[PDB]
Amino acid sequence: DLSVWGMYQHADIVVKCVMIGLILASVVTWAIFFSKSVEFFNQKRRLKREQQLLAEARSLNQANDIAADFGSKSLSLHLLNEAQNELELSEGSDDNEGIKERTSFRLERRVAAVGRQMGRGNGYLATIGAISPFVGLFGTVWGIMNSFIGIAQTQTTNLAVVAPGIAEALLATAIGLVAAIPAVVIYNVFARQIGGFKAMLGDVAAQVLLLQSRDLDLEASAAAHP
Amino acid sequence: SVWGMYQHADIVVKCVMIGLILASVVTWAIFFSKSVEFFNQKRRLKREQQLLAEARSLNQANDIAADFGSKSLSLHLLNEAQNELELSEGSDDNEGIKERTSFRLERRVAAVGRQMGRGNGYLATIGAISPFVGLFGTVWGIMNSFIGIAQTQTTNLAVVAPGIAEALLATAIGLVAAIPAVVIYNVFARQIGGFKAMLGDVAAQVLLLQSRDLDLEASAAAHP
Amino acid sequence: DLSVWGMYQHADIVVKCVMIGLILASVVTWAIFFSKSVEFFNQKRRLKREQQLLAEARSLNQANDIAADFGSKSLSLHLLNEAQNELELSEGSDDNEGIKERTSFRLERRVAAVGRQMGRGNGYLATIGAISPFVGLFGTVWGIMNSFIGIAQTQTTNLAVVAPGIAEALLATAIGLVAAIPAVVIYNVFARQIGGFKAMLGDVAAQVLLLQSRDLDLEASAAAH
Amino acid sequence: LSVWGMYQHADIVVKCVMIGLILASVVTWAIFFSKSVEFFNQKRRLKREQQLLAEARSLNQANDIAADFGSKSLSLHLLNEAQNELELSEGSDDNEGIKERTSFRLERRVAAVGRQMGRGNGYLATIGAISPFVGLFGTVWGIMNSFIGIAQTQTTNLAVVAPGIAEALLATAIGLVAAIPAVVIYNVFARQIGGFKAMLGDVAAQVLLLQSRDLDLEASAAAHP
Amino acid sequence: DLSVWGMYQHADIVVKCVMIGLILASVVTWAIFFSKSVEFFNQKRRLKREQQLLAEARSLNQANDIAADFGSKSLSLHLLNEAQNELELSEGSDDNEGIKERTSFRLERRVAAVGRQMGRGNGYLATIGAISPFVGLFGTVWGIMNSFIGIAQTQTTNLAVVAPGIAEALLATAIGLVAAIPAVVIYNVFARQIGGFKAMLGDVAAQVLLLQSRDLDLEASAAAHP
Amino acid sequence: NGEMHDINVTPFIDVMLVLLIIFMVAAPLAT
Amino acid sequence: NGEMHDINVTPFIDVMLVLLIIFMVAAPL
Ligand SMILES: CCCCCCCCCCCCCCCCCC(=O)O[C@@H](COC(=O)CCCCCCCCCCCCCCC)COP(=O)(O)OC[C@H](O)CO
Ligand SMILES: CCCCCCCCCCCCCCCCCC(=O)O[C@@H](COC(=O)CCCCCCCCCCCCCCC)COP(=O)(O)OCCN
Ligand SMILES: CCCCCCCCCCCCCCCCCC(=O)O[C@@H](COC(=O)CCCCCCCCCCCCCCC)COP(=O)(O)OCCN
Ligand SMILES: CCCCCCCCCCCCCCCCCC(=O)O[C@@H](COC(=O)CCCCCCCCCCCCCCC)COP(=O)(O)OCCN
């Protein structure tokens, strides 16, 4: 034979389907990578700028005055709106402990939802990077099984007749490893990025929570004591 | 032919290939059944959640979800909140009411998760023990081959090739039966987790509505 | 060679001892299974009956009157007695929140302890299912190595006196896998059954807790107003 | 020749693999013996202490019971932490604060004792999980040296492959001998540490219940003559 | 053939690049190990002497007068400063429970952030220890496959004309495992050490929380009940 | 539920190479 | 930060599987 560009041609039926299935796996891996990488870089840059602007907040009104201009798909604006909307709905309630508990609960749900939406896509990468070595192994086990069939039937010697069979059988697992290397590299990259992003988001949410709690306490005190 | 060597194997490779083909058939039956059920339940719950996100009180929420059927998980959750609010009548510790309600709702969400994960036991066990039953098939095949090489002392290693063919066929069947089990199991684990979090969000919505109503009503009744 | 018995006899010394060790491991796994399955089955049936009988108790006193005849080894009687013993020890207190904290704490203690005592036994199944292929395979490597060192003599001949001596190492491997498959099947069956049972127990514990909490709050509010 | 003569004429890298794995085995067995004696003694003391404190009924009575449990008594460090907090918070009239701080310290210290018990388990886990790959490195070196051998000459007999096969068998045989007991022992010790941490948590829970009950009762009696 | 080092330059392009990639991965692993190991040792030592010094503080003011000289990068001084910062930002409140809730929230955020700032290169270590055996096996399979393609194109039924190719292949595999195993043991070592140090930080933060709670409750019980 | 759900590679690699060593020492027998 | 892959998985049975085809017909020829 000559190379993979010629060996894939006359390989087999089931070995050829294994090779095509693994090529499709690799293509979907690189598509996932490109899309998620550009979106992650965009979102993380935006949120890091917004947190650096919010770090100079001393009250929830001042934080809304800062973040009045953060576009419309800014996670920071969504969290500040959860806090403000809870304060709006509970207008008429005199249980500031209740207000704080409700807002903590809403922000917990919202940060979890953003985490899951960011992570959506990594199941493909995990399962590909985990099982493509085994699909390659099945391709080579079938190739070698057919090699032994060919040796048994019309009995022959001189491995110069079986060499193309073993070449075809190994090519399957070579494509397997080629398709399961970038899946694991990309999966680890994105696990680290998602972790860092969920942590930064939790920091912004905790900032909102501290601002609201501190404001409620100081208001109740300065209104009841004097 | 691949089908002509299934009978060639003597006993304990044939009764390993039958076992693994049955395991694969059961795997795919489980997959089709559970996947249709998950799609249906997730569609219904998503419709009901985005239908309830426009409710401002538990009264309006029971008005909305008054007709969600009977297998409606959102209806189960709303009725557990209202059942607690009804059993605790004559009480005055609204924090106690909220505590018990959240307790029951969390128990209920976990119960629905566990009731959905029913069969993933088979998927896990098969995905773990199928490569080993295949490999035991192949080791037994090669052992039987080397035993047959000694009775007739056929010193040529060109005629015992079908024995190794059968051994490797048992291993390939082991992998065919073992890989879809692991893939499908991971998919179902992940899909159950996602649906469980969406259900937790509907539960959280019920909890927020109940707490808000309780505090608003108590404050209004205390300060006329 | 021979089929099975002469195969074991020809297993020289270390292959023979490893095959014996693995047969005894398989026997102990099947003993664990056949002796834990009836215990699990009886306990789960009993607890499911008790829980269904108690789901119609609207106050802790009615729950006690119902579960008064459940025997001495009834888990639901143990839980209801945790609740009642706490309500008896705190006699003279006036902190319903404190009583609820203490009772919930004791009840989670009891439920975790019952879970541990149910699971007691799965360690042996996990260990065997996780090391049995390796013991069979060490027997295999030693058998092949000893056959190799036995033919390490000149042996300028082609009569295949290696076939019997090399078709017993593989036998130790096959016995290793026969001892490793049912260990994992049974470990998974028992892990699922223990999870299910512990969830049922948690259901009964939560029912006890809610009953006690309602009665505390209702008593307090009725006495205050 | 025998297995010793097999080891004597193996490659340098294969001898270093085998030395590393035998020393890993020796450290596994030293760990097993030391940790086994310490677990037996610790769990014996603790079980006796808990079975003594099962009849406490009050924090003062528990202190007078445990006044002489030596000084290594974990069930004495916990009692003295509860008492130390109840004494550092003298003059404070908030009892929920005292209960909260005591519970915080006791969870802290139970976690500390658990982390001290699980000391060496990291090493056992590392060996038991890695050693098959050091064995596989030895095997691959053996096969590669067999092939360099059959390339040096032009023939392929048993004599030119014997060294590579000796290496491939011996290296992975010691791999298995060093990775089977690491897994067995790591599992028995993880199970025993889980059991001991549970026993320690149960004594901690006793201390918490006694303290909290006593605080509530004394406050009720002080507020209602 | 010749030797190990006399048989890594005569391999094909794919196998040579595989072996060079694995050697660079092993070098990166060892540099990471040495740097982070001296860092962890230093940090653990400084924190231990700080915790010893503080374990004899009865008031938050006394703890802050002990830690008035721990330096600038002192994690303990950061935690005491966060406690004092919440307590002086909420000046005017009367919700001691609010102050303690905000303080505990902030200190646990800070502890977790230090943990994640310590686990920095472990992504490199895990990726290397997970993909290096695969790069070794891609090398060996490409080597054996090229060898058989050559044997079939040359029509030489011997084995001495094919053994060196298999030698170099299996060499690439052994180097794959050499680059994999140390990375994995060091990743486990660093995960354990990071868990231990995070428990030590948790204990210092718990000390701060207890000092603050006692201070607040004693101040209240003295000023409200003379 | 701590049930075993993923394939293991370690018992599956050490056995399929010992299955090579048997074929590496018994194949030169027929020479 | 994430559920990373730190596993060291090596399904290269395919190699020793091809090594054995070699030695099957290598000596008897
Ligand atoms: C040349 C090679 C020799 C071949 C031999 C191969 C052996 C095959 C594999 C056998 C491994 C079985 C060992 C498994 C160890 C795990 C057991 C375990 O987890 O038990 C711990 C915890 O797990 C449990 O709670 C339940 C385990 C009980 C089951 C033990 C049965 C042992 C019988 C095993 C059969 C093997 C037969 C070997 C014959 C060679 C012990 O806790 P403890 O509280 O009971 O401590 C008591 C203390 O020692 C008192 O002194
Ligand atoms: C040896 C033969 C083995 C072949 C392996 C084929 C496996 C067949 C199983 C096919 C199951 C299809 C999964 C159902 C997908 C629908 C669920 C969904 O929408 O998303 C899932 C994600 O989709 C998957 O998980 C697909 C699994 C990957 C399948 C491809 C891997 C197989 C390896 C290459 C196969 C080519 C070999 C074929 C030649 C014999 C789960 O969500 P998530 O948690 O993972 O992430 C959030 C996404 N919203
Ligand atoms: C070629 C020879 C082969 C030798 C065979 C070796 C087999 C595997 C080697 C196993 C080594 C086990 C490493 C020890 C892990 C224990 C971790 C530990 O105890 O942490 C302490 C110290 O840990 C270390 O510094 C040990 C780190 C050494 C890493 C070794 C890296 C190279 C090992 C790979 C050799 C395998 C090579 C295979 C391929 C050639 C720090 O704790 P502390 O009490 O002092 O304070 C904080 C609480 N933890
Ligand atoms: C280049 C490729 C080949 C690499 C070969 C690597 C060979 C590695 C050999 C094995 C190393 C074994 C390390 C021995 C010390 C392990 C000590 C231990 O087990 O733990 C204690 C370690 O105590 C210490 O203080 C360790 C401090 C670090 C020691 C590092 C030693 C130097 C290792 C450098 C190897 C560099 C090799 C390559 C050089 C180019 C802590 O015990 P504990 O009870 O407090 O906690 C146990 C649970 N974690």
Residue numbers in the entry:
A (entry chain D), E (entry chain C): 9 to 234
B (entry chain E): 11 to 234
C (entry chain A): 9 to 233
D (entry chain B): 10 to 234
F (entry chain Y): 12 to 42
G (entry chain Z): 12 to 40
From the paper:
The energy derived from proton translocation is propagated through the elongated TonB subunit that spans the periplasmic space and physically interacts with numerous TonB dependent transporters (TBDT) at the outer membrane, allowing the active transport of rare nutrients into the periplasm.
The two essential aspartate residues at position 25 point in opposite directions and are in close proximity to the ExbB conserved threonine residues 181 and 148 that form a ring of polar residues in the pore. The two ExbD TM helices pack tightly into the pore, with nearly 80% of surface buried for each helix, and there is no apparent channel in this configuration that would allow a proton to go through. No density is visible for the periplasmic domain of ExbD, likely because the 19-residue linker that connects the TM to the folded C-terminal domain is highly flexible. Four phospholipids were built, three PE and one PG, and are part of the cytoplasmic leaflet of the membrane.
